[PDB]
Ligand binder design. Structure first.
Ligand code: CLA
Ligand code: CLA
Ligand code: CLA
Ligand code: CLA
Ligand code: CLA
Ligand code: CLA
Ligand code: CLA
Ligand code: CLA
Ligand SMILES: CC1=C(/C=C/C(C)=C/C=C/C(C)=C/C=C/C=C(C)/C=C/C=C(C)/C=C/C2=C(C)CCCC2(C)C)C(C)(C)CCC1
Ligand SMILES: CC1=C(C/C=C(\C)CCC[C@H](C)CCC[C@H](C)CCCC(C)C)C(=O)c2ccccc2C1=O
Ligand SMILES: CCCCCCCCCCCCCCCCCC=O
Ligand code: SF4
Ligand code: SF4
Ligand code: SF4
Ligand SMILES: [Ca+2]
Lengths: 74, 733, 143, 162, 74, 64, 80, 74
């Protein structure tokens, strides 16, 4: 269930398609926060027309290693 | 059977290392020594008192000697603002080439260390101006110390040992202590202030060779024996007046001027004499209250028996309290420690606001070190007062003697007292932590306006009621028509108002929303430490989990792992737990003092006022910013004067971490480990020839708590002293 | 028991490999204990000093350094193999002392052949306070 | 204009801080397209910041020397001026806190009048808890009526060792 | 470590355990690193180069940032 | 016969017991002249875990 | 060594003699309880102080008490 | 904790960084060999020299790390 959640988050709430065309300039991100009390500041500008929590799990590099282009496969 | 614990045959018959350690622990518990009577106990206490006085006078004599030999006192008098005080010289064969070159400061020929005790300003204020007067006074203090040592031995001899009633005589003791020790000594001090300190401050040299030929006042006692006592306050020292010479001096001695001095930023020396004189007259007239062997006076037992309100407010009132207090020693010790611990904090709070020594406000490291030193000393003494109160309740509290009085009456609702203390502590903790975390999160979300800021409208009102016209409360002492303002308008109100309205001194500092939360944090620490100590003192002789606790003493490990487990159940354990809270409370009050003064001294008072609301601001602008020069004492590019402080700054961290070991790990694990080491030493070749005289054993449970607390307290003290003196000395004078 | 069985040597000790936890310099300089029992068959028991040893048939004798070790082996043999052991305390000079069971029945029975000692006819809680027993060297419970 | 403070409507530090935040938020607007989701999110955050500054101000709230709003807490000092709203309305917390306490005390007393009241604590009696939750709206009246009758305390039935 | 602390505090930097003063070099790990580096020439002929760039001499960099640079031991 | 009625709730008066000023049900009262014959049983367990104890005749009082 | 005491509120359940791991306590006959037996402690010098008897005591308060005192080679549990 | 501290400081001072035409510049100043021999070197050049980002993290995108930093300490 946890592994499926990481794949679903990378499929919907991430910028994997934007990072795939520029791996040396866009930072990975796979988590977006809702604007309740403040909290917009956490949604950092990670680049690629997207803003969210920058992840350090390496899921994007792993999804790069075994071919995965679109989000439909995720 | 060894013979080292001469006072205890039980520990003397111990075949382990426990005999050595415990031999150094119960060495002063004269109440539990083999074959000890009440008379022998009181006489032993009377001797140890003289030994303490002798070592105190010897210590101060050594301080005068070291400053007179290596300190630049004569060089500091001619320029008390630029030059730095010198404690003593440094002789270390371990020092290198750069250590000798870098440790030489203050205009010296060899390496020395600057003094933070602030004794130079004190001696310069009282009148010491030469390097010889400290020498002759140091030999005088050594002589009086020798006399005290002889006196202590003298009274430990037959036909010279005092009886038991002599010790149990409160009327003459209070009469003599209030008249001679408190009053005659104060009269002699104001005599020295008017005969030496006042003329030396005006350039007129007065010493033992010419004090009998120079009159303190032109009139010369003629007004003291005449109805013209105001002649001693005719011309006070003017504003434009140097403290070393007679430029702009006066001839008055007993004045009454509020505020400070324009050049030294301290109180007027012609006011402390008047103060000590009024205090001397009050104490001497108050020392004739109790009844000695005459036909006048009061009786303490009669006053205590007569103080009982009707309509059963306190039941028996104070009946039996005289015999309860006089018959017990821990009660008197707890009362004395409570009074001393309270006045020590009073000394700390008044010395920074109202500096009494000349050129003391300029020395920034001296003020910080003196305030921190006096506050930590007050905290330890305050913990000792409650510890001795618990010892009193366990050792000498007989319930049949004082039945139904206030002492036995406060014990009936100990659950109510402890529960209400618990409620106050929980309230302050929840709300101070919540306000700090709310301001922190709101500040972290890039929005400082959202954070809650409460203005202390009560303390600001008090400051406006005492003279500060910055807040705007048109109240008395800050108005122009109040009876309190017209009263004293010609006595001390102009100087007091001029000193309180200035925003550069430390007299009634301007408070704001950042002091509100810190004051609440101080209140939280005080109520929590009081809760632990009061609970350990009231529940000392029994509880519902252990009703016969009074039959187990004061410091026992536990009462087994039964009935759920009774770890840390003695009153000693309760005091042990309260030492940590005392350290935390004193650390909070000193962090507050040092940061407010650290931001006031550098003209950036707006830094603390806007960055002291959130804990991240505290950690960044206080612990991280002011520690830039301390850790740079020794780097791979050399070293400097602050390197010693940098070394002890890490030394304190190491002592603290070693204390965590004795606090976390318990005795059984270590007992098995020591057993394996014993087998190793017995079955090893060429080293089995030697053998231990006493069997090696692990430290006890109570001993482990005491050693861990000692390591924790030593690290907590050394680390903060290093950071305080380094951060202040490093960027200021 | 009916007579203190005198501890005698030349008893078959159990087969056991060399252990490491036992009989140090105190077992010789000061004192040590010794437990004897009777085994009805050949079994393997656990010594309170390391591994396991076997039970030699007939009499059995073991030596230890602490009384707690002999008491631990005694309760192990009484609750796991249904035996009746007894141990002694050998002093440095060689004075053997009978230790368990002293009355010889068992220490958890009555037998009506022992006088009570260290008993307080008062209930706990009726003890006087620390203040009353001052400089008397005695304590509330001791009184 | 009390305790030496000044209204948030006439403070330069308040406006300076407002412009600072509106500028640091506006600096992130250039990094995105004028009609996408990050642009819409940044625009919503800017509108909330302007509204908050306007809402915080012109409502009697006053700041002191740094543009940060300060709060007056003394009653009387907060009643003589329009500052009662900032903290003197403590009755809201006192009402909710007393509501929680009265509901819990009513559930403890009623559940104790049953054989073995223990399993009723680990397994709540939800129809009794929901009925007691909606019946305690007038909790101060029940508290004063339960105090005069003496049904709020005990005389001397407590496990004490005093 | 405590000895180097005291030697640096006392003004004697030439009496501490460092590379400039009295040193201690990990010769065994230095020899293993050298063995792994020159190993694909004699004891691994089918291998193109060393199994890692930790002990090598060729620094690789993608996007201007260093990827795997040789590691020295002192 | 000398103690209270079996099955009647009583109050403990031992000042050093875990059930001081509490209410316990009397399970049985011995008639052999022992020091503490009134045996009571309480709903709440003590710190050790037991729930019954035997008291004397003077340290047993009727409920309220 | 430690001082063990047995109060009169004993019921004679013989649990402390079963819990003692050093054979310190014993059961002597008595005429003040239903079991007609009270505990005693003749081998007090062998008390180690583990307080297992106090945990085995079922009456409230405990009928047996272990007051710790001076330590010897036997009471310190030393095997060397 | 000492293992991960050694890794982070050694990588930041001897491998990671950025390469340019005039050599390679590490993340830190390459002070692993001249500052790890003393205990004061760690507390000064690692915990105090670093963590300044964690300290000054308020109001930025990674503002949750300063809150997590203070929260973990509590
Ligand atoms: C006008 C009528 C009057 C009044 C108002 C008083 C009032 C008082 N009398 Mg008095 N008296 C009177 C007539 C009167 N008397 C007459 C006609 C006589 C005969 C001449 C006396 C003779 C007399 C004697 C001999 C004594 C008094 C005493 C007292 C004082 C205490 C009485 C008491 O029960 O303690 C109060 C009752 C309590 C239960 C104490 C409560 C303790 C509280 C709850 C503790 C809370 C502390 C908590 C931490 C607070 C937090 C605050 C924070 C800052 C720490 C009290 C102020 C006694 C006294 O002098 O004490 C000063 C005293 O001994 N009276
Ligand atoms: C390791 C597993 C894991 C974890 C830690 C998370 C964590 C998160 N998910 Mg996620 N998710 C996961 C697995 C996981 N998910 C899987 C397997 C799926 C596929 C089914 C999804 C599908 C999913 C979606 C579609 C969304 C999230 C969202 C979120 C974020 C907050 C929403 C939330 O849970 O509020 C609390 C949830 C509740 C209080 C109750 C759950 C809602 C119930 C079931 C229905 C509510 C009815 C609704 C009103 C209509 C949060 C950080 C949201 C997000 O990213 O925000 C922008 C979002 O919309 N998740
Ligand atoms: C007038 C006669 C007289 C005098 C002068 C003294 C004096 C003294 N007695 Mg004594 N006593 C007397 C009569 C007298 N006694 C009689 C008649 C009896 C029998 C009934 C006793 C029975 C007695 C006993 C049993 C004991 C003493 C003890 C002492 C010593 C107290 C310790 C001390 O030095 O604190 C010094 C106190 C002060 C300096 C004043 C108080 C200080 C307060 C806290 C304010 C601080 C001042 C100021 C703010 C600080 C400035 C200094 C700073 C600038 C450095 C002291 C020297 C004790 C002892 O043996 O020696 C230790 C003791 O045990 N006396
Ligand atoms: C222990 C404190 C103390 C001591 C030992 C002395 C000692 C002395 N003072 Mg003195 N003085 C003191 C406090 C003290 N004073 C204080 C507090 C003041 C402020 C009011 C003064 C103001 C003062 C003046 C103005 C003068 C002295 C003078 C003197 C010298 C002669 C006094 C004399 O014989 O007159 C008579 C003594 C008596 C009649 C007996 C004393 C009165 C009893 C104790 C009451 C003498 C050595 C005179 C002097 O010679 O100048 C150096 C002088 O003119 N004093
Ligand atoms: C007027 C001051 C005073 C006096 C006369 C006493 C007197 C007494 N205290 Mg007491 N106490 C005091 C203040 C005082 N205390 C204070 C301020 C505290 C709070 C810290 C305590 C807390 C306290 C406790 C908890 C206990 C006593 C006990 C006792 C009694 C015997 C133990 C003893 O003293 O042997 C001497 C003790 C020692 C020699 C131990 C010294 C080890 C010290 C603490 C460590 C030193 C720190 C470190 C090594 C410094 C070196 C730093 C390094 C870098 C160089 C004795 C009657 C004990 C008792 O009642 O008997 C059961 C008891 O348990 N006291
Ligand atoms: C105990 C300390 C404490 C306190 C006093 C506060 C107080 C506050 N916080 Mg804060 N906070 C805290 C801790 C604390 N916080 C901690 C520890 C954190 C970290 C987790 C935070 C994180 C945090 C954030 C992120 C935010 C706050 C915010 C706020 C404000 C919100 C006001 C509100 O909730 O709207 C109103 C709530 C209600 C009206 C609740 C309704 C309850 C019922 C339905 C009504 C009550 C009955 C009603 C009054 C009728 C009674 C009748 C009566 C008159 C008789 C408020 C001033 C927010 C803010 O805006 O900052 C200013 C916000 O952004 N806090
Ligand atoms: C213990 C809490 C507390 C504290 C510290 C204060 C403090 C203060 N109140 Mg106050 N007050 C309180 C509770 C408190 N109040 C409560 C519970 C109420 C009822 C709701 C009031 C109602 C009240 C009124 C009506 C007034 C004050 C006023 C004042 C100020 C001047 C007091 C005065 O007597 O004038 C001067 C004293 C000269 C000696 C002062 C700062 C006055 C004020 O607001 O100043 C304008 C004012 O008139 N208060
Ligand atoms: C609704 C039950 C309830 C009630 C009426 C009280 C009432 C009280 N408690 Mg208390 N408490 C409770 C539960 C309760 N507590 C629980 C569950 C705990 C364990 C966390 C505590 C722990 C506690 C401590 C440590 C202290 C008090 C204290 C006090 C008194 C001071 C006022 C206060 O608010 O303190 C604070 C109360 C708390 C911090 C507890 C808050 C936690 C919530 C409100 C409890 C949850 C109750 C639950 C929802 C009820 C179920 C509803 C039902 C329909 C199912 C007061 C009479 C103080 C005292 O000694 O008296 C002066 C004190 O020091 N309480
Ligand atoms: C345990 C115990 C003990 C101990 C105790 C203690 C420790 C206590 C304490 C305490 C404390 C530590 C206290 C304190 C105090 C103080 C106070 C209480 C005060 C006061 C006062 C006032 C009232 C004032 C007023 C004023 C004036 C006059 C002037 C200015 C203004 C004002 C207002 C400030 C003993 C041994 C005894 C025994 C018993 C028990
Ligand atoms: C390490 C350790 C030991 C073993 C510690 C021992 C045996 C200390 C002795 C080691 C040397 C001898 C200490 C060095 C002594 C000091 C440097 C100087 C002491 C001299 C003063 C009295 C003057 C315990 O006994 C123990 C007991 C209970 C809880 C935790 C522990 C525990 O952690
Ligand atoms: C947890 C129970 C549901 C389990 C099945 C989940 C089915 C989800 C199937 C994929 C749904 C994707 C919807 C995305 C809509 C927006 C498309 C744009 O990217
Ligand atoms: S202090 Fe040690 S022996 Fe005593 S109860 Fe706690 S764990 Fe057991
Ligand atoms: S404390 Fe241990 S050794 Fe002593 S009598 Fe009780 S169970 Fe036996
Ligand atoms: S365990 Fe307690 S009640 Fe039972 S026999 Fe021993 S002392 Fe008596
Ligand atoms: Ca001179």
């Amino acid at each position: 269930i946890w592994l499926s959640g990481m794949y679903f988050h990378g499929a919907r709430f991430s910028n994997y398609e934007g990072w795939l065309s520029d791996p040396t300039h866009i930072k990975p991100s796979a988590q977006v926060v809702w604007p309740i009390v403040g909290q917009e500041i956490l949604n950092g500008d990670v680049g690629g027309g997207f803003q969210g929590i920058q992840i350090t799990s390496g899921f994007f590099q792993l999804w790069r290693a075994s071919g995965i282009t679109s989000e439909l496969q995720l | 059977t060894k013979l080292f614990p001469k006072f205890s045959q039980g520990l003397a018959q111990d075949p382990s290392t426990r005999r050595i350690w415990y031999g150094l622990a119960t060495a002063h518990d004269f109440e539990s020594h083999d074959g000890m009577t009440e008379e022998n106990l009181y006489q032993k206490i009377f001797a140890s008192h003289f030994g303490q006085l002798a070592i105190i006078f010897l210590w101060t004599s050594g301080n005068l000697f070291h400053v007179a030999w290596q300190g630049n006192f004569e060089q500091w008098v001619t320029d008390p603002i630029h030059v730095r005080p010198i404690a003593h010289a440094i002789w270390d064969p371990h020092f290198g080439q750069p250590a000798v070159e870098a440790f030489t400061r203050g205009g010296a020929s060899g390496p020395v260390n600057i003094a933070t005790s602030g004794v130079y300003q004190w001696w310069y204020t009282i009148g010491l101006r030469s390097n010889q007067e400290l020498y002759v006074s140091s030999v005088f203090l050594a002589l009086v110390s020798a006399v005290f040592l002889f006196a202590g031995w003298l009274h430990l001899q037959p036909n010279f040992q005092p009886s038991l009633s002599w010790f149990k005589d409160a009327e003459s003791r209070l009469n003599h202590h209030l008249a001679g020790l408190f009053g005659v000594s104060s009269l002699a001090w104001t005599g020295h202030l008017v005969h030496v300190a006042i003329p030396e401050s005006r350039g007129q040299h007065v010493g033992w060779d010419n004090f009998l030929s120079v009159l303190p006042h032109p009139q010369g006692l003629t007004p003291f024996w005449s109805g013209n006592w105001a002649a001693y306050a005719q011309n006070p020292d003017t504003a434009s007046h140097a403290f070393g010479t007679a430029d702009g001096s006066g001839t008055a001695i007993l004045t009454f001027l509020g505020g400070f001095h324009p050049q030294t930023q301290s109180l007027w020396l012609s006011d402390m004499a008047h103060h000590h004189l009024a205090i001397a007259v009050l104490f001497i007239v108050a020392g004739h209250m109790y009844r000695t062997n005459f036909g006048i006076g009061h009786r303490l037992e009669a006053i205590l028996e007569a103080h009982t309100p009707p309509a059963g407010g306190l039941g028996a009132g104070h009946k039996g309290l005289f015999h309860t207090v006089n018959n017990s020693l821990h009660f008197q010790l707890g009362l004395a420690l409570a009074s001393v611990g309270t006045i020590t904090s009073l000394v700390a709070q008044h010395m920074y606001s109202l500096p009494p020594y000349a050129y003391l406000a300029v020395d920034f490291t001296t003020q910080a070190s003196l305030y921190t030193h006096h506050q930590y000393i007050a905290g330890f003494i305050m913990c000792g007062a409650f510890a001795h109160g618990a010892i009193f309740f366990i050792r000498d509290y007989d319930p049949e003697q004082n039945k139904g009085n206030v002492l036995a009456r406060v014990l009936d609702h100990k659950e109510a007292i402890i529960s209400h203390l618990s409620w106050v502590s929980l309230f302050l903790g929840f709300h101070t932590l919540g306000l700090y975390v709310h301001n922190d999160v709101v500040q972290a979300f890039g929005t400082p306006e959202k954070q809650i800021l409460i203005e202390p409208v009560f303390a600001q009102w008090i400051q406006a009621a005492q003279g500060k016209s910055l807040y705007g409360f048109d109240l008395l002492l800050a108005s122009s028509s109040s009876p309190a303002y017209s009263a004293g308008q010609s006595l001390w109100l102009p100087g007091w108002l001029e000193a309180i309205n200035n925003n550069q001194n430390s007299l009634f500092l301007t408070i704001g929303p950042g002091d509100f939360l810190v004051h609440h944090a101080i209140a939280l620490g005080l109520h929590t430490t009081t809760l632990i100590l009061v609970k350990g003192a009231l529940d000392a002789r029994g509880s519902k989990l252990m009703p016969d606790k009074k039959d187990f003493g004061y410091s026992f490990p536990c009462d087994g792992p039964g009935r759920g487990g009774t770890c840390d159940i003695s009153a000693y354990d309760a005091f042990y737990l309260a030492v940590f809270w005392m350290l935390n409370t004193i650390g909070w009050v000193t962090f507050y003092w040092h940061w407010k003064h650290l931001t006031l001294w550098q003209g950036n008072v707006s830094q603390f006022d806007e960055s002291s609301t959130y804990l991240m601001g505290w950690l960044r602008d206080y612990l991280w910013l002011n520690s830039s020069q301390l850790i740079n004492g020794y780097n791979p590019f050399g070293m400097n004067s602050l390197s010693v402080w940098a070394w002890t700054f890490l030394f304190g961290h190491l002592v603290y971490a070693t204390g965590f070991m004795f606090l976390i790990s318990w005795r059984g694990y270590w007992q098995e480990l020591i057993e394996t080491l014993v087998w190793a030493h017995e079955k090893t070749p060429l080293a089995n020839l030697v053998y231990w005289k006493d069997k090696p054993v692990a430290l006890s449970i109570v001993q482990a708590r005491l050693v861990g607390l000692a390591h924790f307290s030593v690290g907590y003290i050394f680390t903060y002293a290093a950071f305080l003196i380094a951060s202040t000395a490093g960027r200021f004078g | 028991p009916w007579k203190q069985p005198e501890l005698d040597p030349d008893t078959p000790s159990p087969i056991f490999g060399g252990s490491t936890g036992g009989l140090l310099r105190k077992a010789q300089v000061e004192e040590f204990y010794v437990i004897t029992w009777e085994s009805p068959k050949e079994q393997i028991f656990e010594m309170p000093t390391g591994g396991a040893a076997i039970m030699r048939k007939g009499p059995n004798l073991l030596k230890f350094a602490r009384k707690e070790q002999c008491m631990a082996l005694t309760t192990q043999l009484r609750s796991k193999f249904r035996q009746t052991p007894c141990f002694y305390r050998v002093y440095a000079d060689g004075k053997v002392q009978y230790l368990h069971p002293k009355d010889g029945v068992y220490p958890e029975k009555v037998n009506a052949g022992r006088v009570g000692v260290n008993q307080n006819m008062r209930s706990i809680g009726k003890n006087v306070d620390p203040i009353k027993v001052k400089f008397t060297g005695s304590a509330p419970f001791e009184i | 204009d009390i305790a030496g403070l000044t209204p948030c409507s006439e403070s330069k530090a308040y406006n300076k801080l407002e412009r600072k935040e509106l500028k640091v938020l506006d600096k992130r607007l250039k990094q995105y397209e004028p009609g996408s989701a990050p642009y819409l999110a940044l625009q919503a955050t800017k509108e909330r910041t302007e509204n908050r500054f306007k809402t915080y101000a012109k409502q009697g709230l006053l700041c002191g020397n740094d543009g940060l709003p300060h709060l007056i807490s003394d009653p009387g000092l907060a009643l003589r001026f329009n500052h009662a709203g900032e903290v003197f309305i403590t009755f809201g917390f006192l009402y909710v806190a007393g509501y929680i306490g009265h509901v819990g005390r009513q559930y403890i007393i009623l559940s104790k009048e049953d054989a073995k009241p223990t399993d009723k604590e680990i397994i709540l009696d939800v129809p009794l808890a929901l009925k007691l939750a909606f019946q305690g709206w007038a909790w101060p009246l029940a508290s004063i009526q339960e105090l005069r009758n003496g049904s709020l305390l005990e005389k001397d039935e407590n496990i004490t060792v005093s | 470590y405590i000895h180097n602390d005291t030697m640096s505090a006392l003004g004697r930097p030439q009496d501490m355990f460092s590379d400039t003063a009295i040193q201690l070099q990990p010769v065994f790990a230095q020899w293993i690193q050298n063995t792994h580096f020159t190993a694909p020439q004699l004891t691994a002929p089918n291998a193109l180069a060393a199994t890692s760039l930790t002990w090598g001499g060729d620094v690789v960099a993608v996007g201007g940032k260093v990827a795997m640079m040789p590691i020295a031991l002192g | 016969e000398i103690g209270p009625k079996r099955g009647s709730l009583v109050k403990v008066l031992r000042p050093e017991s875990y059930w001081y000023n509490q209410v316990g049900k009397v399970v049985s009262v011995d008639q052999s002249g022992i020091r503490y014959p009134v045996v009571v049983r309480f709903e709440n367990q003590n710190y050790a875990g037991v729930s019954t104890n035997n008291y004397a005749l003077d340290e047993i009082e009727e409920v309220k | 060594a430690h001082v063990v005491k047995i109060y009169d509120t004993c019921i004679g359940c013989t649990q402390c003699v079963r819990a003692c791991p050093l054979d310190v306590l014993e059961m002597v006959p008595w005429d003040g309880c239903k079991a007609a037996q009270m505990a005693s402690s003749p081998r007090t010098e062998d008390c180690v102080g583990c307080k297992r008897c106090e945990t085995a005591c079922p009456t409230d308060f405990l009928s047996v008490r272990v007051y710790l005192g001076n330590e010897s080679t036997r009471s310190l549990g030393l095997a060397y | 904790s000492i293992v991960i501290f050694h890794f982070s400081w050694k990588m930041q001072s001897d491998v990671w960084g950025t390469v340019t035409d005039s050599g390679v510049s590490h993340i830190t100043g390459g002070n692993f060999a001249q500052s790890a021999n003393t205990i004061n070197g760690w507390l000064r050049d690692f915990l105090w020299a670093q963590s300044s980002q964690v300290i000054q993290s308020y109001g930025s995108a990674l503002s949750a790390y300063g809150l997590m930093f203070l929260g973990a300490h509590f």
